[PDB]
Amino acid sequence: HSDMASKMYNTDKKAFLGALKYLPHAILKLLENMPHPWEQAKEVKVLYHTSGAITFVNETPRVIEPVYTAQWSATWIAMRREKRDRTHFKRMRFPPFDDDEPPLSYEQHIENIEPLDPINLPLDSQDDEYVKDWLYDSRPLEEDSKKVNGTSYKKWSFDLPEMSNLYRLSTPLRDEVTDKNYYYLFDKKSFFN
């Protein structure tokens, strides 16, 4: 349906104008699924029209809060380091492509190229031993019988030593201040007042 000139598409052609109302939705349902720094290649569930009318990524990201503040504390640190280290770090030019250049389809060019690895981070075999196994999975545990609920992935259930290690990692990203008496005029109600 990319090539349409014919008569036989004068249904689908009208179909297209229809989905023009629904598009913005799709963008949102696309653009909250971004693979995130550490994942290599993400796989989603799209619900597509059968006229080629539009394709809604269908899922929603569910990531445990602490495990998530971990993952981003990892990448945060690896960043600061890999900024300090290398010499000329070249930000890329925008836009990525010029206008003459119709975007190259997936089945041909990109599927053979293989990913060229992400951030991750050194971690350890000693400190992090509990967490080094799974911490970088796309979604950390689609299955751990006891640790997480199950494939539908709701209600994570953890253990002290782990949750410790997470505490340890996320130290860059955490609020760190434990005394309520700190916020004195910085609570809400002193704002509303």
Partner 1 sequence: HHIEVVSKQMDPLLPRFVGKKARKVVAPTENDEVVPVLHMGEADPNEW
Partner 2 sequence: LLIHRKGLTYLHLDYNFNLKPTKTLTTKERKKSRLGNSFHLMRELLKMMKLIVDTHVQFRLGNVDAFQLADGIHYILNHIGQLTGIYRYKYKVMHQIRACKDLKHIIYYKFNKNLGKGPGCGFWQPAWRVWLNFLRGTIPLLERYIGNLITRQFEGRSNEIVKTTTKQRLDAYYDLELRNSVMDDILEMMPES
Partner 3 sequence: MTSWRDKSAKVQVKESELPSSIPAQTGLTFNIWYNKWSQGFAGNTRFVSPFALQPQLHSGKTRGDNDGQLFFCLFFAKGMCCLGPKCEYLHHIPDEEDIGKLALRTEVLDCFGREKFADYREDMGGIGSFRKKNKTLYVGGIDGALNSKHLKPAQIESRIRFVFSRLGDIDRIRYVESKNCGFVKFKYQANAEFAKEAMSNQTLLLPSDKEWDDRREGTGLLVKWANEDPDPAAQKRLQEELKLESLNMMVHLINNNTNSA
Partner RNA sequence: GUAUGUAUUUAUUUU
Partner RNA sequence: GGAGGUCAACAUCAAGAACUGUGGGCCUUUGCCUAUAGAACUUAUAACGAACAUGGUUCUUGCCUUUUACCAGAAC
Partner RNA sequence: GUUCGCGAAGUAACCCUUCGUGGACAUUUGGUCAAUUUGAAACAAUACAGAGAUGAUCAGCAGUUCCCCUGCAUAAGGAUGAACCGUUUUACAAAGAGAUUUA
Using CB under 7 A, list all residues that contact RNA.
6-8, 11, 45, 58-62, 139, 142, 149-154, 180, 187-189
Among 1, 2, 4, 12, binds partner 3 (CB under 8 A): 4
Q: What is the DSSP string of 101-165?
A: -PPPPTTTTGGGT-----------SSSSHHHHTTTTSSSS-S--TTTB--TT---B---HHHHHH
Site membership for partner 1, residue 26 (CB under 8 A): no
Q: CA 70 to CA 63: how far, in whole Å?
A: 11
Residues 49-78 within binding reach of partner 3 (CB under 8 A) = none
Binding mask 122-161 for partner 2 (x = CB under 8 A): ----------------------------------------
Which residue among 4, 18, 34, 171 contacts partner 1 (CB under 8 A)? 18
- The conformational region for residue 114 under phi > 0 = left, psi -120 to 50 = alpha, else beta, is left
Binding partner 1 (rule: CB under 8 A), the pick from 30, 36, 39, 51 is 51
Interface pattern 7-46 for partner 3 (x via CB under 8 A): x-----x---------------------------------
Q: How far is the CB of 69 from partner 3 (least distance, A)?
A: 49
**Rule CB under 8 A: is residue 22 a binding residue for partner 1?**
yes
Q: What are phi and psi of 56, to 5 degrees?
A: -95, 115
Nearer to partner 2, 102 or 151 (CB): 102
Six-digit token pair at 88?
A: 């000329």
Q: At what angle do helices 160-170 and 65-84 cross, to 10 degrees?
A: 40
CB neighbours (10 Å) of residue 169?
A: 26
Residue 35 near partner 2 by CB under 8 A? yes
In the complex with partner 3, the residue whose CB is nearer, 15 or 173, is 15
User: Nearest-CA neighbor of 119 among 64, 163, 82?
Assistant: 82
Binding residues (CB under 8 A) for partner 3: these are 4-7, 13
